[PDB]
PDB file of C-alpha atoms and ligand atoms in Angstrom:
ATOM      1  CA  UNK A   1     -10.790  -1.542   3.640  1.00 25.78           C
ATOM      2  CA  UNK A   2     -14.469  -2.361   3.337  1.00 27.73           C
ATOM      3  CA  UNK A   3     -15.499  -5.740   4.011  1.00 28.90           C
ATOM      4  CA  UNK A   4     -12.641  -6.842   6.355  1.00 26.83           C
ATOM      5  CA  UNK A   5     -11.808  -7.245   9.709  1.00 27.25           C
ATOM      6  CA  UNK A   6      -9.621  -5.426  12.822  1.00 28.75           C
ATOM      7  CA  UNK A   7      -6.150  -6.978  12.076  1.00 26.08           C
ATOM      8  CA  UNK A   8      -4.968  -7.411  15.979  1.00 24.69           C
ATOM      9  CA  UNK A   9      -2.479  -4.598  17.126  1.00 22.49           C
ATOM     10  CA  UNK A  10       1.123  -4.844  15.134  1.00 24.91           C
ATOM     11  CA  UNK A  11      -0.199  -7.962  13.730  1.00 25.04           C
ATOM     12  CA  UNK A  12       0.981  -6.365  10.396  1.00 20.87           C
ATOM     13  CA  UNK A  13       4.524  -4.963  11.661  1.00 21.49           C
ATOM     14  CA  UNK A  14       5.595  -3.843   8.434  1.00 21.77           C
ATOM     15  CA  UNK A  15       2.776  -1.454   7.549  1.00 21.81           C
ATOM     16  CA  UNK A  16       3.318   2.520   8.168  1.00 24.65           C
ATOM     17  CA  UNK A  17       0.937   5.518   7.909  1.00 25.02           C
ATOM     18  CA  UNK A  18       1.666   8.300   6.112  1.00 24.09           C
ATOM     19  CA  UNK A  19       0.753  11.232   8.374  1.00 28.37           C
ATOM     20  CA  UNK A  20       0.769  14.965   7.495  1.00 31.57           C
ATOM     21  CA  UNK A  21      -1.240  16.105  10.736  1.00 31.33           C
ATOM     22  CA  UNK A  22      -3.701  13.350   9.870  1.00 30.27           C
ATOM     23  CA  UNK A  23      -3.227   9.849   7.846  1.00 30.51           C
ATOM     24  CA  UNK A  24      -3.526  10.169   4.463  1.00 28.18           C
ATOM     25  CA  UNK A  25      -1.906   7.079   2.894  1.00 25.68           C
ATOM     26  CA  UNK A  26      -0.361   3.367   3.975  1.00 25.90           C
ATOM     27  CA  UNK A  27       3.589   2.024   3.147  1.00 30.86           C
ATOM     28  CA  UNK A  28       5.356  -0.658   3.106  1.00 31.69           C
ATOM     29  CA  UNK A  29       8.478  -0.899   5.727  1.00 31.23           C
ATOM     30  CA  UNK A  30      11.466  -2.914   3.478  1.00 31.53           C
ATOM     31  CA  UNK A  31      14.515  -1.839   5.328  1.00 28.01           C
ATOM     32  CA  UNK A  32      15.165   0.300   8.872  1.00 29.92           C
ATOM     33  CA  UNK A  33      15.292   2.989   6.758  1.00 28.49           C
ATOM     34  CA  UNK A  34      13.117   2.816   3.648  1.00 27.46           C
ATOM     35  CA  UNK A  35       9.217   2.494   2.949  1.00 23.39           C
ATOM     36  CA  UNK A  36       7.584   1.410  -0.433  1.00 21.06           C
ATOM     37  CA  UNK A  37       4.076   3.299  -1.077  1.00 19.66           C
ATOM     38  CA  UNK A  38       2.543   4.825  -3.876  1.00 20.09           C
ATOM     39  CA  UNK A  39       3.591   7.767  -6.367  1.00 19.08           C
ATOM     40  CA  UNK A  40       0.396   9.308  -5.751  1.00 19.24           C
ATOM     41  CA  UNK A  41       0.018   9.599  -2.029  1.00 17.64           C
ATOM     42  CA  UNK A  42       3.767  12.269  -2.493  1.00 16.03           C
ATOM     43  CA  UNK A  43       3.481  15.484  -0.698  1.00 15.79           C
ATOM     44  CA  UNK A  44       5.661  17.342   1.519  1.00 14.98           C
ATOM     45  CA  UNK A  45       5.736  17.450   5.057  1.00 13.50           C
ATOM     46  CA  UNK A  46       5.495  13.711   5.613  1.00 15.55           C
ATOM     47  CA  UNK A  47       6.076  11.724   9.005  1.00 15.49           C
ATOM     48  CA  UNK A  48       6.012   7.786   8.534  1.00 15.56           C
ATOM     49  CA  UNK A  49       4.348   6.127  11.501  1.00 15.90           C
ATOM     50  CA  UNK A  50       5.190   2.896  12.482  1.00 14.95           C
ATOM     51  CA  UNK A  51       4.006   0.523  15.006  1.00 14.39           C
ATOM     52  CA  UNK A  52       0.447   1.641  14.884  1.00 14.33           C
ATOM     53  CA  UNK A  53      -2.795   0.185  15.373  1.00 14.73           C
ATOM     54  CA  UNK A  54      -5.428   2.957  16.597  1.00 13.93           C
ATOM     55  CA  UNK A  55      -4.070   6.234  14.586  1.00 15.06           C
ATOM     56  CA  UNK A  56      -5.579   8.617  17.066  1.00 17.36           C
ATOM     57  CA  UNK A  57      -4.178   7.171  20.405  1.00 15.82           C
ATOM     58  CA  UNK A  58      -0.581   6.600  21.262  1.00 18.20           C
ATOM     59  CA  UNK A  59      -0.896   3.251  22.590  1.00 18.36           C
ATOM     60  CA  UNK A  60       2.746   2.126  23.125  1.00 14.56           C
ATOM     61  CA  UNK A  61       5.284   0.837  20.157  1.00 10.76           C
ATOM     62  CA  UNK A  62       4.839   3.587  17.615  1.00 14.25           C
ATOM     63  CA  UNK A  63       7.943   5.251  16.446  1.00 14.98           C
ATOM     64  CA  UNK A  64       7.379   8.831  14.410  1.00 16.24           C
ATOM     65  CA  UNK A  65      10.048   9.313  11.691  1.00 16.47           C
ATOM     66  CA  UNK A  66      10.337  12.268   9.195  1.00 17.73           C
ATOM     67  CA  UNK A  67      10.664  11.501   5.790  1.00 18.33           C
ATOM     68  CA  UNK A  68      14.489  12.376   4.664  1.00 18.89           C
ATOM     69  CA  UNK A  69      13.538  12.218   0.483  1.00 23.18           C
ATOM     70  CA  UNK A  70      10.718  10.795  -1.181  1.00 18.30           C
ATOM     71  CA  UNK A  71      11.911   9.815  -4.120  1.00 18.03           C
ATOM     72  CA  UNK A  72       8.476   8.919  -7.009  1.00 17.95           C
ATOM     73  CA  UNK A  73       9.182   6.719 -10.421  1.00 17.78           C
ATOM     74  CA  UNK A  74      10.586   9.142 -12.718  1.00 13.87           C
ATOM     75  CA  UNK A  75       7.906   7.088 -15.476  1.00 16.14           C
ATOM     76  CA  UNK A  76       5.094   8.030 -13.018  1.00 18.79           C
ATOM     77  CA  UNK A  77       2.000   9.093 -15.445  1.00 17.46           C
ATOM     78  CA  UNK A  78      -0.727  10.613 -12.927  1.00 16.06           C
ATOM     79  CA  UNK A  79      -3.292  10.050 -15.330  1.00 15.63           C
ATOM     80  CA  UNK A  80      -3.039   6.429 -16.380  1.00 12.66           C
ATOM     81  CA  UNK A  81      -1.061   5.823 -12.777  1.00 10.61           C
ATOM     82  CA  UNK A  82       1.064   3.788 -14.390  1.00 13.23           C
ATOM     83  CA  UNK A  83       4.925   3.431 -12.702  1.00 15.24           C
ATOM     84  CA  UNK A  84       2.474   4.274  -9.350  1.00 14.89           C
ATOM     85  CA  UNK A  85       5.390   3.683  -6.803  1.00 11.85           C
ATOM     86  CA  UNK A  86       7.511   6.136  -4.616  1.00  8.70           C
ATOM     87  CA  UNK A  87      10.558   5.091  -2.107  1.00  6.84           C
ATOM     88  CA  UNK A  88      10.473   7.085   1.202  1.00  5.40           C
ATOM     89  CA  UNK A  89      13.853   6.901   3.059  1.00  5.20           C
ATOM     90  CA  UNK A  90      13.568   7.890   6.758  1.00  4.97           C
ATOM     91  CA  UNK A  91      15.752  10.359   8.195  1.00  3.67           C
ATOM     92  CA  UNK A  92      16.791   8.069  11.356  1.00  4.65           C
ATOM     93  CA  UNK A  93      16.192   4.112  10.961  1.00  6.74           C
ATOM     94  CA  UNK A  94      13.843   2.823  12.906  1.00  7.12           C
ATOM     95  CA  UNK A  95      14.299   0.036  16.019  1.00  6.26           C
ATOM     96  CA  UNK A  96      12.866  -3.010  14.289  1.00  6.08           C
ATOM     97  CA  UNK A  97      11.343  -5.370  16.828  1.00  7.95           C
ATOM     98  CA  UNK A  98       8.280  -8.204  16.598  1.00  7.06           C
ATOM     99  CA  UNK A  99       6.220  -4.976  16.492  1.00  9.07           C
ATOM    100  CA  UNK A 100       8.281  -3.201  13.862  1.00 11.21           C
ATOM    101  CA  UNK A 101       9.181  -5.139  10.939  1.00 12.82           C
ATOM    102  CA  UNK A 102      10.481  -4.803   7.213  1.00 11.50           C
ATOM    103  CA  UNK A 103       8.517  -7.105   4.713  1.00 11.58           C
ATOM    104  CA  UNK A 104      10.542  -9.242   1.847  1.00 12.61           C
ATOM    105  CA  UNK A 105      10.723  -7.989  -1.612  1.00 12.59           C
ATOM    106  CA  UNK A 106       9.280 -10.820  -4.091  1.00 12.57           C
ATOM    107  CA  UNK A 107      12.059 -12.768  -6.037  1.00 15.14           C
ATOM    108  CA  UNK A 108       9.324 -13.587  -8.826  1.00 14.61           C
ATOM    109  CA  UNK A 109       6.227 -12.758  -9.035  1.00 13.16           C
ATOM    110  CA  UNK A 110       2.415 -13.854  -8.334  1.00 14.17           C
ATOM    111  CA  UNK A 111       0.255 -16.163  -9.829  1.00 15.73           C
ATOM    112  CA  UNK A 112      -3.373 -15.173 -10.377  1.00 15.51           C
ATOM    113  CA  UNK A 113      -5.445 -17.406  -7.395  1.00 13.14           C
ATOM    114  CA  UNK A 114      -2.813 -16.427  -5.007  1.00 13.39           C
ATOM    115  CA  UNK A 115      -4.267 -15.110  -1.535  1.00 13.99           C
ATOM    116  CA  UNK A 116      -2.948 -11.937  -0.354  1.00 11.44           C
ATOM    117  CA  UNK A 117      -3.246 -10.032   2.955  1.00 10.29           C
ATOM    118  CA  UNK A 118      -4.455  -6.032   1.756  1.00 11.09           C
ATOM    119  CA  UNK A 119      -4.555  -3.745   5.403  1.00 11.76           C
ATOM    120  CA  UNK A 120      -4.814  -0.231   6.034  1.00 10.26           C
ATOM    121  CA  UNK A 121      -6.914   2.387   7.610  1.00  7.53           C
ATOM    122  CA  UNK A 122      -9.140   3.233   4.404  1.00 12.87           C
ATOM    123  CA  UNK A 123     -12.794   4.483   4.593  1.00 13.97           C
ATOM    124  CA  UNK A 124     -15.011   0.820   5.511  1.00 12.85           C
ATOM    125  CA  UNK A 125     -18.029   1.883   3.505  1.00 11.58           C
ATOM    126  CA  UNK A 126     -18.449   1.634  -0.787  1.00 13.72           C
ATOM    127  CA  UNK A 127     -21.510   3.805   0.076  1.00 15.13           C
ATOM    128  CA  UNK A 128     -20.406   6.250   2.031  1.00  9.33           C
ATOM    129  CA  UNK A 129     -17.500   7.455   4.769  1.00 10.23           C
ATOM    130  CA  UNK A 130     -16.217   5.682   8.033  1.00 10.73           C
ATOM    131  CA  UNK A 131     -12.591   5.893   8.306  1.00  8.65           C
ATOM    132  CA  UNK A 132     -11.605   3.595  11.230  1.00  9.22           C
ATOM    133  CA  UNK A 133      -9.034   4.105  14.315  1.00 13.17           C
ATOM    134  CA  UNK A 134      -7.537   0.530  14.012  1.00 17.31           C
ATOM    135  CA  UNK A 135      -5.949  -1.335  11.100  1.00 18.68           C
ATOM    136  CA  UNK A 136      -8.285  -3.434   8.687  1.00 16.90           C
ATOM    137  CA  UNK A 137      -7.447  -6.401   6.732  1.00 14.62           C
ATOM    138  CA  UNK A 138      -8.687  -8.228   3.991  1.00 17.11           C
ATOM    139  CA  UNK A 139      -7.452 -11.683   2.364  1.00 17.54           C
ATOM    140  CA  UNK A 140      -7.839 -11.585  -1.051  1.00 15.48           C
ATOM    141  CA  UNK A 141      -7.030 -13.208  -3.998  1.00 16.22           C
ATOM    142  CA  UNK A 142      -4.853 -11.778  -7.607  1.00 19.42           C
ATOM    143  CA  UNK A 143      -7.035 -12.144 -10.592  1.00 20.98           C
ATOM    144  CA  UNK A 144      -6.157 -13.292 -13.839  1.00 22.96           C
ATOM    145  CA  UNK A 145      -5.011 -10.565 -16.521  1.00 23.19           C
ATOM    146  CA  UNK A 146      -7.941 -11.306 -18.558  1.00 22.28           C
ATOM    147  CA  UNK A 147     -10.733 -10.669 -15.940  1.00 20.49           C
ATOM    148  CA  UNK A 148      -8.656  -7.712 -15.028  1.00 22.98           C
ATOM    149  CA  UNK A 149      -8.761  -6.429 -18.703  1.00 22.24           C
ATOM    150  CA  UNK A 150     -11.453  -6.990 -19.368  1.00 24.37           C
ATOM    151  CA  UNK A 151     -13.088  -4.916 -16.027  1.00 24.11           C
ATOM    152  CA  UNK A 152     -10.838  -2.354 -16.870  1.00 22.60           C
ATOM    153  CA  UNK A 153     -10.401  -2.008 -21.062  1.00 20.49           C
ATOM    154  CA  UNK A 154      -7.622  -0.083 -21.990  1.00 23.70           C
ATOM    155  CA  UNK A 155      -6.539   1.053 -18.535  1.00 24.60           C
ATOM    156  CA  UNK A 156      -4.242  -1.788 -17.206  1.00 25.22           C
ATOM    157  CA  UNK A 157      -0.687  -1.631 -17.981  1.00 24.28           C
ATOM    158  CA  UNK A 158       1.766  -4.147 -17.701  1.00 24.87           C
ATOM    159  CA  UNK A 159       2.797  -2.950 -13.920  1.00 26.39           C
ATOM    160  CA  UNK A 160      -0.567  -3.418 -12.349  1.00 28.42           C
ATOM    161  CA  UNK A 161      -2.691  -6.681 -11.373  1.00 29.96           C
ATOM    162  CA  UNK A 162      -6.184  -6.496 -10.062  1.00 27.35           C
ATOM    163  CA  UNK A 163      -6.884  -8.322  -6.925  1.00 25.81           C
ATOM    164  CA  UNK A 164     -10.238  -8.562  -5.078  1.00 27.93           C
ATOM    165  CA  UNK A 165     -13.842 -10.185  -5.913  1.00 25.06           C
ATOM    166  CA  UNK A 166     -15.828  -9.149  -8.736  1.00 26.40           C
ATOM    167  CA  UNK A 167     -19.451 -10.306  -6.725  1.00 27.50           C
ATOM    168  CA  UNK A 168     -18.186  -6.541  -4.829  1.00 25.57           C
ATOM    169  CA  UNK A 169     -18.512  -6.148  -0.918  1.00 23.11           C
ATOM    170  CA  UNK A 170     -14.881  -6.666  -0.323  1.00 21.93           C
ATOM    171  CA  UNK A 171     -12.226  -3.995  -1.550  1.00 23.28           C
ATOM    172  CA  UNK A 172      -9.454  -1.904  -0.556  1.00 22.47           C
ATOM    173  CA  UNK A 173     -10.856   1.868  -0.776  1.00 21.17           C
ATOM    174  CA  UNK A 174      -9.541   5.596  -0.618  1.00 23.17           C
ATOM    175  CA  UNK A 175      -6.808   6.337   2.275  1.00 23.57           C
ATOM    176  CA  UNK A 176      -5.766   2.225   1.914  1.00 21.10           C
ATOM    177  CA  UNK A 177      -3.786   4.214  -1.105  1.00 16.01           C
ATOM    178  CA  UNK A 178       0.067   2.998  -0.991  1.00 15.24           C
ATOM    179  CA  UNK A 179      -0.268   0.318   1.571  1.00 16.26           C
ATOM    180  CA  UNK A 180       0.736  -3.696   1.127  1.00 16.09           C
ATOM    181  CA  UNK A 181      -0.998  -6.375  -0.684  1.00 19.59           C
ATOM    182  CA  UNK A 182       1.324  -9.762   0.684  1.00 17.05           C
ATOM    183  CA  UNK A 183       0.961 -12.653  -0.463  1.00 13.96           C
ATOM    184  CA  UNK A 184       3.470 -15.740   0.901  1.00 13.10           C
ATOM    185  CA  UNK A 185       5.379 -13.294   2.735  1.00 12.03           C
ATOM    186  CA  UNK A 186       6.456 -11.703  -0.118  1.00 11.80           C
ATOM    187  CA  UNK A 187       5.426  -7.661  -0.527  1.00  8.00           C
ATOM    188  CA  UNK A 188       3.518  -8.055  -4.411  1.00 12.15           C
ATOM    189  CA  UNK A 189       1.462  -4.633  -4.668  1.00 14.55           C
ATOM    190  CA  UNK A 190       0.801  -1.491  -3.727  1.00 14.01           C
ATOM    191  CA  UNK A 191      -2.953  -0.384  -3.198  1.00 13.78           C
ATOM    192  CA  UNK A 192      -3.241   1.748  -6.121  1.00 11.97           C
ATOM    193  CA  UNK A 193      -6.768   2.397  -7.620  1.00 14.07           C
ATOM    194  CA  UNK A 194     -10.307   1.530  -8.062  1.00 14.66           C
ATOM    195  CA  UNK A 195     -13.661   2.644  -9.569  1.00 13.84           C
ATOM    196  CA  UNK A 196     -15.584   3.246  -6.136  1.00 17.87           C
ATOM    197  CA  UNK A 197     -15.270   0.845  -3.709  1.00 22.14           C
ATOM    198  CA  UNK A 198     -16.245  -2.538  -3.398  1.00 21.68           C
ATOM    199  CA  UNK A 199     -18.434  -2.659  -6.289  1.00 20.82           C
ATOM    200  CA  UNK A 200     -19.709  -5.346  -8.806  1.00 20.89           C
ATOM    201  CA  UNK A 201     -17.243  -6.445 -11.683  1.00 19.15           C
ATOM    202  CA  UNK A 202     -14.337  -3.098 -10.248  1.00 19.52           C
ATOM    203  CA  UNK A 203     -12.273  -5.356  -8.548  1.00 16.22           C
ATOM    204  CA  UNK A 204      -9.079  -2.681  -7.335  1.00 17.87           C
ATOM    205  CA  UNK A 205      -6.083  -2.094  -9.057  1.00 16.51           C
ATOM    206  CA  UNK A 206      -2.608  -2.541  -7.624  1.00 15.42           C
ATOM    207  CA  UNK A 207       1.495  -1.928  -8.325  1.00 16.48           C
ATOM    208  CA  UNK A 208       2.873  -5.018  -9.717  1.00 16.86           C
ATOM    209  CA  UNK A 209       5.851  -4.793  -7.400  1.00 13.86           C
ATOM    210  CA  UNK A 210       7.805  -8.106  -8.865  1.00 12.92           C
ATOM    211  CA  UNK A 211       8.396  -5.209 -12.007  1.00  9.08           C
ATOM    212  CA  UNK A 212      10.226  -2.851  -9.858  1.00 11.44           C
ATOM    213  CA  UNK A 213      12.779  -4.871  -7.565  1.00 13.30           C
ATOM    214  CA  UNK A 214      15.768  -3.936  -9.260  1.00 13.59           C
ATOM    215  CA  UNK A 215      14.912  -0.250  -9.565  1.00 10.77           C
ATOM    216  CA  UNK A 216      14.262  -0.504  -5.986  1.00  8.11           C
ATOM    217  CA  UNK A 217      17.257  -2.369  -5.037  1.00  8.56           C
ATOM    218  CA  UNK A 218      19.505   0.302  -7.862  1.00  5.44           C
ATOM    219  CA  UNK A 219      17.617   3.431  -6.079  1.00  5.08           C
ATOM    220  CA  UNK A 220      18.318   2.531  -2.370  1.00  5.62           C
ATOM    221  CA  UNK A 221      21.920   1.323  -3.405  1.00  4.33           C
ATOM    222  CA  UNK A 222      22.475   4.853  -4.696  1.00  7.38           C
ATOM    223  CA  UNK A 223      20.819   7.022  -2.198  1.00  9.65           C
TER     224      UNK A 223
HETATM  225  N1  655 B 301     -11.286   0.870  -4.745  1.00 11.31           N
HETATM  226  C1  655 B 301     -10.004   0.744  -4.506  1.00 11.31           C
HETATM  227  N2  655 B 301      -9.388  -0.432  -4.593  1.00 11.31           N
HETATM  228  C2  655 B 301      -9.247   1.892  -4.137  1.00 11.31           C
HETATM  229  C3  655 B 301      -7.989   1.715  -3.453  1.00 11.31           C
HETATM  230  C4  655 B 301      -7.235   2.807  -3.071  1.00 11.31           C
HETATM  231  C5  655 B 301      -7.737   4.050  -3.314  1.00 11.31           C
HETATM  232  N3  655 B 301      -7.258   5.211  -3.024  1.00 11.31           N
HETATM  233  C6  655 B 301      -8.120   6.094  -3.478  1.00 11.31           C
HETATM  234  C7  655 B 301      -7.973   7.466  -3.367  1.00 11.31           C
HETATM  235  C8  655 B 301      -9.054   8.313  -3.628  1.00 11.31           C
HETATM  236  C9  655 B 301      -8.941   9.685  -3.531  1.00 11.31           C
HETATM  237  C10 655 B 301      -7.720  10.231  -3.153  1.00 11.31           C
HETATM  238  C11 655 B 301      -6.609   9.389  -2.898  1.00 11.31           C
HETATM  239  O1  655 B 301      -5.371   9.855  -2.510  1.00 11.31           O
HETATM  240  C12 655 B 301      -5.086  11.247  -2.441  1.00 11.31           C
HETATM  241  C13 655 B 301      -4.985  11.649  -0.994  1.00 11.31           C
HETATM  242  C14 655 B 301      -3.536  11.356  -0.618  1.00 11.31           C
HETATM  243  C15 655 B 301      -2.823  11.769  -1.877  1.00 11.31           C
HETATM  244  C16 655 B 301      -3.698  11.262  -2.990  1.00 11.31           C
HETATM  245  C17 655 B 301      -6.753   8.008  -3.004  1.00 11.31           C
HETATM  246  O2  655 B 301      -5.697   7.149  -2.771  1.00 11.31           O
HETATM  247  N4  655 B 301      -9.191   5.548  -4.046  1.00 11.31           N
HETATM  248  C18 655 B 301      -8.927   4.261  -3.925  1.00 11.31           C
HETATM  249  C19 655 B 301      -9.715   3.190  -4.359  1.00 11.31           C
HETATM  250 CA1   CA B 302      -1.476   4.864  17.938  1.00  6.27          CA
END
């Protein structure tokens, strides 16, 4: 996240790190047993930490689950990103507390000038690398289609939404990948892409989530 500021330990229950010996992407907790991050951050060999706030120390309130099946849009296109969503169901649900927490799925969705709260452990710098230990955030707001487009000609689909300021300085940024863009306590995107980090006119790019819920509702029902 560059540009925004320490969160507060489990102030953001519902966010996870994807870990692999190191953290590598964010998620979304929904259920005890299922996580909502991005088609792109799938590999094998995935443990879902929850309850984080420094990555590196075990500070109390973490739980480590294994992955059971990750389960990636069957329309994913890995070079336009489009359909950029994966499920990850957990192979033991976790204890949800104040610390732990599953997030809402939206019943409709945003509007552009809504705020939304973007976190994860991302590189802090445009210019540069400085991965943090604890959990950035950043408020910021969904743009309208047209700025978005018109950032971005043809690259923006129907399932993304750009969120984000186009003066730059304030951005989600690589390893934020997959993590939770809320706003009204509803989960509405998915950190997807960018052009760099924080810079003029690229605001990022995220999963319009509000196009998804009943594939995600159909897929957990089924699995
Ligand atoms: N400017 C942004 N809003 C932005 C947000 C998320 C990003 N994630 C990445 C990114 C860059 C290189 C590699 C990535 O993931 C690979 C490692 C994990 C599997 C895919 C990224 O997510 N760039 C990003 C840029
Ligand atoms: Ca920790």
């Amino acid at each position: 996240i560059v540009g925004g500021y320490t969160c507060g330990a489990n102030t953001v229950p519902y966010q996870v790190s994807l870990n692999s010996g190191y953290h590598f992407c964010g998620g979304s907790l929904i259920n005890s047993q299922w996580v909502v991050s991005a088609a792109h951050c799938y590999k094998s060999g995935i443990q879902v930490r929850l309850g984080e706030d420094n990555i590196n120390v075990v500070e109390g309130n973490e739980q480590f689950i294994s992955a059971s099946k990750s389960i990636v849009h069957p329309s994913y296109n890995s070079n336009t990103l489009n359909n950029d969503i994966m499920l990850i169901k957990l192979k033991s649900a976790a204890s949800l507390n104040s610390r732990v927490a599953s997030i809402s799925l939206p019943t409709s969705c945003a509007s552009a000038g809504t705020q939304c709260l973007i976190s994860g452990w991302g590189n802090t710098k445009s210019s540069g690398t400085s991965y943090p230990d604890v959990l950035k955030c950043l408020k910021a707001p969904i743009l309208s289609d047209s700025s978005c487009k018109s950032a971005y000609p043809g690259q923006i689909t129907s399932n993304m939404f750009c969120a984000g300021y186009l003066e730059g300085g304030k951005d989600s940024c690589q390893g934020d990948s997959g993590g939770p863009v809320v706003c009204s306590g509803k989960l509405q995107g998915i950190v997807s892409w960018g052009s760099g980090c924080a810079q003029k006119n690229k605001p990022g790019v995220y999963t319009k989530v509000c196009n998804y819920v009943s594939w995600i509702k159909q897929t957990i029902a089924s699995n």
